[PDB]
């Protein structure tokens, strides 16, 4: 968003303006996202309650807000999806992000996310 383009008065920071090189995303199907998630390594509903806990190697994959299993190695998952997206097998817009404070990786195929390109 533009930092300096805003009204003043009632809407001093409540009516923003999009910047130049942005792109709002549209929705898509979640088929190949799940299909690559379950190959790359995830498992849920068979794991003992204890697993998903303070143990470091339990990053739990979340897609669009629904848990899709847990991965022992977060890096392989974030990196492999990212190489796959760059290769073009997964839609360019989908984003894999990782929060290490709470071990949840976050595959978002939401549609409506503010996006932008980088080199």
């Amino acid at each position: 968003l533009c930092p300096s383009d805003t009204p003043e008065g009632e809407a001093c920071g409540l009516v923003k303006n999009l910047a130049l090189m942005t792109h709002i995303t549209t929705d898509m199907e979640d088929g190949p996202i799940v299909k690559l998630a379950s190959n790359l390594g995830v498992e849920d509903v068979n794991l003992l309650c204890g697993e998903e806990l303070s143990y470091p190697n339990v990053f739990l994959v979340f897609l669009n807000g629904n848990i899709l299993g847990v991965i022992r190695d977060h890096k392989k998952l974030v990196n492999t999806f990212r190489l796959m997206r760059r290769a073009g097998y997964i839609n360019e817009f989908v984003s894999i992000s990782t929060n290490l404070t709470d071990r949840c990786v976050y595959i978002s195929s939401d549609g409506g996310r503010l996006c932008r390109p980088y080199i």
Binding site: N39, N57, V58, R72, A87
Partner: protein, 92 residues
């Protein structure tokens, strides 16, 4: 601990039941290779190299392998307990 099980399997000859999540590949003797540095790779059928390494914490519960023989006409018999799970992933 990824290749340790194989070395521990090497340390005691006792047969160990293992849990394997193969990738979702339909059928279109397999070979397992342990790379130097512990990077176990299963060079499976079709000569594809699938990397399988580590898994969820296991043994934190009792997981038991049982062969249901339809005991009304057979027997349900526990054959083994469980060991660390193993997950197989395709590689790129």
């Amino acid at each position: 601990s990824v290749a340790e099980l194989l070395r521990e399997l090497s340390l005691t000859k006792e047969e160990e039941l293992l849990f394997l999540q193969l990738p979702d590949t339909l059928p279109g003797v397999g070979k397992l290779l342990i790379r130097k540095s512990g990077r176990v790779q299963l060079l499976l059928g079709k000569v594809t190299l699938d990397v399988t390494m580590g898994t969820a914490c296991s043994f934190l519960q009792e997981l038991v392998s049982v062969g249901l023989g339809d005991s009304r006409t057979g027997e349900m018999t526990v054959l083994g307990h469980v060991k660390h799970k193993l997950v197989c992933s395709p590689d790129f």
